[PDB]
Amino acid sequence: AKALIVYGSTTGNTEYTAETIARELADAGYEVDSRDAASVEAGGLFEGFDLVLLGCSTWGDDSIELQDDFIPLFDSLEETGAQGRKVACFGCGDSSYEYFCGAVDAIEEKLKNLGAEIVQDGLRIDGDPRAARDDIVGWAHDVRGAI
Ligand SMILES: Cc1cc2nc3c(=O)[nH]c(=O)nc-3n(C[C@@H](O)[C@@H](O)[C@H](O)COP(=O)(O)O)c2cc1C
């Protein structure tokens, strides 16, 4: 199978996560196309993938904001065809906050209402993804034995 990894990272956390996740896949027999959202384009993007990996960090204090690079993709997500698509969402945040990884929640929601089938519960990392690296290896892993 063929997977798409699209990520929004500001400080490099979600970028790290998507890489760990990328290999996760690739070492398993997976063909993987990883991309920065900063550059993606919504026009049938999801097209011809068996799984879509959609990542993003949270910003904001009062209001939930999505990693910046990712917003314009968030905005035009019904243009990508996530109909009966297989999508799992991930990102980084800090639980010191009230709407911890609230960016994972919104992603997942527009996905549903859109058509995707979420194969698994979003992976919400609290901290440097790097020290949770195992939590990560297992999630990539649970989404495989899931399709
Ligand atoms: C201005 C700001 C507000 C944040 N907003 C929240 C929050 O609402 N939810 C939470 O999960 N993460 C929140 N975080 C921090 C995480 O989003 C951020 O540290 C994270 O690691 C993103 O890594 P990245 O560079 O891949 O986007 C806050 C941190 C700061 C700087």
Side-chain angles (χ1 to χ4, degrees), residues 60-125:
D61 225 299
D62 268 355
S63 155
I64 294 170
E65 296 161 43
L66 324 163
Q67 193 287 337
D68 190 54
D69 288 314
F70 207 109
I71 295 171
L73 161 58
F74 178 66
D75 289 340
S76 16
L77 224 61
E78 81 177 49
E79 277 166 33
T80 62
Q83 202 57 243
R85 202 67 74 177
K86 303 187 158 306
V87 284
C89 302
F90 60 108
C92 293
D94 200 327
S95 52
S96 91
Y97 317 82
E98 195 187 334
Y99 329 116
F100 175 42
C101 281
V104 186
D105 309 25
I107 299 180
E108 310 197 340
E109 206 32 77
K110 179 81 180 178
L111 294 168
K112 228 170 253 182
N113 284 34
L114 264 183
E117 308 186 26
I118 296 58
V119 327
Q120 193 77 205
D121 285 343
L123 170 60
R124 293 155 181 22
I125 286 183

Side-chain angles (χ1 to χ4, degrees), residues 9 27 53 84 124-125 136:
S9 213
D27 265 0
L53 305 202
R124 293 155 181 22
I125 286 183
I136 301 174

